[PDB]
């Protein structure tokens, strides 16, 4: 069921970015919102997985905002 799992992961990923105070940077929040809303409207999984790689790269660029080496165990 990978299309519904990608759309459900999009909602959880933007909820994590919002709690990390990304709304405090208007030019960054406006890109995260557009990647999220596109993944929800997508119809082919090969589009939705490319936009998921851009949206996740926001969270990985915020060095020290998540303990990724502990979350990834």
């Amino acid at each position: 069921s990978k299309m519904s799992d990608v759309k459900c992961t999009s909602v959880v990923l933007l909820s994590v970015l919002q709690q990390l105070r990304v709304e405090s940077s208007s030019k960054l929040w406006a890109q995260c919102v557009q990647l999220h809303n596109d993944i929800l409207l997508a119809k082919d999984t090969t589009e939705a997985f490319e936009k998921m790689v851009s949206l996740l790269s926001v969270l990985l660029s915020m060095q020290g905002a998540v303990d990724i080496n502990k979350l990834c165990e």
């Binding site: 799992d5 992961t9 851009s54 996740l56 660029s61 979350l71 990834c72």
Partner: protein, 183 residues
């Protein structure tokens, strides 16, 4: 508590009409049964009101305590849920950027989708460089990228011919690589 009086009264009343005892005695028994039943119902109404009141208090304590437990832990729950869902998708591009990020190989930009777009990535050590850079090329997010410049931590430019095992102690790590999407 008045049940004992109710139980003994109904047994004595049914025994009296079964044996055919005198009607004034059967009336004394029936009338005793009516007040004993009324005392049993009056006791039962008290316990049923106290049990109703305790069931509400126990329920409201459960809702109050568990609602506060949901609300207080939300940040740790969301991050744990996210890094659980990314394992079930099992996409190679998502796995490739997460497995690089464990080791400190992270992007400075949002990763671009269009051809010939700019990307910048941190390289912590030669032992990481060797797994992702190959000649003029760089491999990240399960795609091929072409390198256009590299810098020391002091912003001094470094040529791709300088980055080798024997020379690696002389470079000022972490390096920053700039690359473009190939197509």
């Amino acid at each position: 508590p008045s049940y004992a009086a109710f139980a003994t009264a109904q047994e004595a009343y049914e025994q009296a009409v079964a044996n055919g005892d005198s009607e004034v005695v059967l009336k004394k028994l029936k009338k005793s049964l009516n007040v004993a039943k009324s005392e049993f119902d009056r006791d039962a109404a008290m316990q049923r009101k106290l049990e109703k009141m305790a069931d509400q208090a126990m329920t409201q304590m459960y809702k109050q305590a568990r609602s506060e437990d949901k609300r207080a832990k939300v940040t740790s729950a969301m991050q744990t849920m996210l890094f659980t869902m990314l394992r079930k998708l099992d996409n190679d591009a998502l796995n490739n950027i997460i497995n690089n990020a464990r080791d400190g190989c992270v992007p400075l930009n949002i990763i671009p989708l269009t051809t010939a777009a700019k990307l910048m990535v941190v390289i912590p050590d030669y032992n990481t460089y060797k797994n992702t850079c190959d000649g003029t090329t760089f491999t990240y997010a399960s795609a091929l990228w072409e390198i256009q410049q590299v810098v020391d931590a002091d912003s001094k430019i470094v040529q791709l011919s300088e980055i080798s095992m024997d020379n690696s102690p002389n470079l000022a790590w972490p390096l920053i690589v700039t690359a473009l999407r190939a197509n």
